[PDB]
Amino acid sequence: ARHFVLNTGAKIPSVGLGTWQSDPGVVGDAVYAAVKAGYRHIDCARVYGNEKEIGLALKKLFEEGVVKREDLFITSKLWNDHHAPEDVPEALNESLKDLQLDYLDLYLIHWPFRVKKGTNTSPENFITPDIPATWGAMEKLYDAGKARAIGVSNFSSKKLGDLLAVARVPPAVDQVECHPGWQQTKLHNFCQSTGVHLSAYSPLGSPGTTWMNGNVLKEPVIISIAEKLGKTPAQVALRWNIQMGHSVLPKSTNEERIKQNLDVYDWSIPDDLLAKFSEIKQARLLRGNFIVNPQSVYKTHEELWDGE
Numbered sequence: 001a002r003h004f005v006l007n008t009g010a011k012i013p014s015v016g017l018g019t020w021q022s023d024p025g026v027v028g029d030a031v032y033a034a035v036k037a038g039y040r041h042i043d044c045a046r047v048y049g050n051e052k053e054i055g056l057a058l059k060k061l062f063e064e065g066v067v068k069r070e071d072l073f074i075t076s077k078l079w080n081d082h083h084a085p086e087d088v089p090e091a092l093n094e095s096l097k098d099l100q101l102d103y104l105d106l107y108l109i110h111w112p113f114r115v116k117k118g119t120n121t122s123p124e125n126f127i128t129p130d131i132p133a134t135w136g137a138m139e140k141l142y143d144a145g146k147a148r149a150i151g152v153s154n155f156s157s158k159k160l161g162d163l164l165a166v167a168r169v170p171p172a173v174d175q176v177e178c179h180p181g182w183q184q185t186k187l188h189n190f191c192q193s194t195g196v197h198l199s200a201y202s203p204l205g206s207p208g209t210t211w212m213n214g215n216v217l218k219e220p221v222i223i224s225i226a227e228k229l230g231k232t233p234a235q236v237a238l239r240w241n242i243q244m245g246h247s248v249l250p251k252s253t254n255e256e257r258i259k260q261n262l263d264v265y266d267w268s269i270p271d272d273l274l275a276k277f278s279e280i281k282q283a284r285l286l287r288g289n290f291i292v293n294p295q296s297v298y299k300t301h302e303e304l305w306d307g308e
């Protein structure tokens with residue numbers, strides 16, 4: 001259970017190191033510690049502003065002979081301002097430059113949302129998405145082998161369905177918020193029915209993010225199962241996702257928590273304790289406030305998420 005198989009045939013390691021909010025000065029030693037500890041999957045994005053420092057950590061690991069390039073699964077994301085079909089390859093090239101890599105294992109459309117190239121998220125800069133024309137350009141990256149798998153992030157079942165109808169290369173991954181607090185059963189189903197892999201971002205509910213109301217590790221049901229099974233609350237939360245057939249992208253810069261989050265393979269959650277999860281109140285923590293707006297295509301929360 002140390003990996004899942006994507007629709008491309010590629011194995012995606014079921015635990016990756018998240019690097020959202022990993023500062024340029026700490027992220028390098030975090031990636032290093034993670035890989036040394038057995039991680040084979042790093043989740044990155046242009047907009048995280050730390051890809052240069054992840055690249056220095058990867059080049060250290062290779063030259064030090066901890067791993068070779070082929071042992072690692074490296075993910076990055078196309079930001080909202082590079083959706084125009086002519087801008088997509090520059091975006092991938094910018095991230096390959098910073099990571100100092102020949103290819104990405106996974107390249108994702110970060111949001112089903114577009115702004116003018118080189119502009120900030122402000123309504124004046126909003127441009128109607130053309131996901132087919134962006135996906136069209138993402139396919140050319142996949143053809144050339146520069147992105148060995150392509151996929152999307154923050155797509156509902158509907159938006160994922162609409163892309164699959166027009167795709168020549170089907171999305172390999174839909175990366176979404178998914179944890180005990182927000183279980184995404186519908187999309188989980190739609191993904192297994194379509195052969196799309198569901199990858200769980202904020203798998204601990206992103207408790208370090210002051211503007212998200214994460215308290216997943218404090219839920220009575222998770223604290224219980226941890227105590228019952230002699231595992232930490234984090235361990236339980238992550239294991240739940242892995243038993244659902246989702247990969248998890250736990251972020252840490254603390255060597256010990258990095259180690260603990262990989263320790264989700266040798267042990268299981270009994271079916272009894274797996275039943276105890278629908279006793280958990282459901283709330284989406286990352287609502288996409290920043291792109292729900294009167295001048296947005298998404299005038300409502302329900303419009304962004306298609307009721308989900």
Ligand SMILES: NC(=O)C1=CN([C@@H]2O[C@H](COP(=O)(O)OP(=O)(O)OC[C@H]3O[C@@H](n4cnc5c(N)ncnc54)[C@H](OP(=O)(O)O)[C@@H]3O)[C@@H](O)[C@H]2O)C=CC1
Pocket residue numbers: 017018019020021043044110153154175176200201202203204205206207208209217232234235249250251252253254257258260261286
């Ligand atoms: N739009 C998208 O596609 C999105 C993608 N992502 C990706 O998913 C990743 C993971 O989600 P993220 O929102 O970062 O939050 P997570 O759910 O991964 O939680 C991270 C927080 O939990 C702490 N933590 C880590 N390990 C443990 C542990 N074992 N016990 C207790 N606390 C722990 C971290 O602190 P510390 O570092 O001190 O250990 C940090 O404050 C992101 O980092 C990013 O790579 C996430 C958000 C959006």
